[PDB]
Amino acid sequence: HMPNYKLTYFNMRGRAEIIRYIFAYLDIQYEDHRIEQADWPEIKSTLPFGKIPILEVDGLTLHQSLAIARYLTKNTDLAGNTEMEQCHVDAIVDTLDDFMSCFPWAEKKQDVKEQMFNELLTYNAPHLMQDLDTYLGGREWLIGNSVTWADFYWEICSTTLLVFKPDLLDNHPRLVTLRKKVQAIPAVANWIKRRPQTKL
Amino acid sequence: MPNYKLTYFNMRGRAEIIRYIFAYLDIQYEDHRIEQADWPEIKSTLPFGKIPILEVDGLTLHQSLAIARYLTKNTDLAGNTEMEQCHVDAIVDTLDDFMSCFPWAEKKQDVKEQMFNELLTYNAPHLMQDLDTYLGGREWLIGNSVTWADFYWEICSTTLLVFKPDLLDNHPRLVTLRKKVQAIPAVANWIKRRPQTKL
Ligand SMILES: NCc1ccc2ccccc2c1-c1ccc(C(=O)NCCN2CCOCC2)cc1
């Protein structure tokens, strides 16, 4: 049975975006609940682990953005065709998440924030882009012969990095091509044109 | 069975979850611990310059939890429903997110010590509370039987207890869960035979 899905997150792409891409690709109806800082204290206090996004499935609350994303892609063409391919997909996803999680997003000190950010973007990001390009190895998609949610996450994470470092992929045309390929998937393209425009 | 070769530092660290799984499933594997000497060298071979990696018949896999999930698919350590599987993944990422916050590599000693103390005295207790409430009076974290999330809880808490021995004083149920994991025969045997390291 098709459940009632309610996604709760801040008004931004951020960590909720991978879930939104999956819902769009699979044409799944859901409530895109974007809260305001004002209502967060209250909502926060009722969550088992106090972090968002969370996805309520028929009232049962699920947490952890990638755990949710994997759950929604189970038994779909986005998971990876084989058990091994699923491992490769899960691996690329965590490699991207690991990096994104290195940034101190809370930081209020514009300068010292822009220093931890500056180091990561200037000194570490290019190394990761190289390894991702090497991994793709001239192939059309990151894993196997068709799109997986690892490709969705690559496009999502790179879009965020590009906001702060526009020259991120100047030495990786093949990574730019993969981004465009993901962005061209009809359901994804439709979501990209319609989603609320936010900075992150 | 496939020829498995696990590569990681001589420590429990991020490879331990894989090691527990192999033990519990009675799957033979080469437990390869590298030399801090050949580290800057062997690094240039890894897919993303990170360990652990798991070689399976000439094919390389990386990312500890991706590998752990792969090894537990279709086994009794996996969740029993698609939903339980999501709960397993979420608890594991919540634990990993926290352990990943520690500056294990920080060379600046005063900075490293400030951050460790901050995480252990301020953030850690909140997580212990949330985990204890999540477990409630149930037997295991997810469902009615042990899953690899219980393994990960025991692994991560063992390391946190090294730095903060009184971490679970107000959480007897979490202590009980640790002991239940440690009491599983195959796991107990591994804990008894593994290299004794701080981390
Ligand atoms: N048992 C440790 C443990 C447990 C659970 C985890 C979960 C997620 C991520 C990491 C972990 C980990 C975990 C993994 C690796 C390291 C590590 O590489 N530290 C090296 C410290 N050296 C000290 C001397 O100076 C040079 C550096 C520390 C903790």
Ligand SMILES: N[C@@H](CCC(=O)N[C@@H](CS)C(=O)NCC(=O)O)C(=O)O
């Ligand atoms: N790895 C987790 C991280 C969850 C997370 O840290 N979320 C942040 C928002 S991006 C949060 O809820 N922090 C705000 C708070 O702790 O009050 C996930 O991907 O879901």
Ligand SMILES: N[C@@H](CCC(=O)N[C@@H](CS)C(=O)NCC(=O)O)C(=O)O
């Ligand atoms: N999330 C990853 C992290 C892998 C990781 O960062 N491993 C560390 C060792 S604990 C590493 O290879 N770093 C050494 C380096 O970057 O030179 C995993 O669980 O496998």
Ligand SMILES: [Mg+2]
């Ligand atoms: Mg993670």
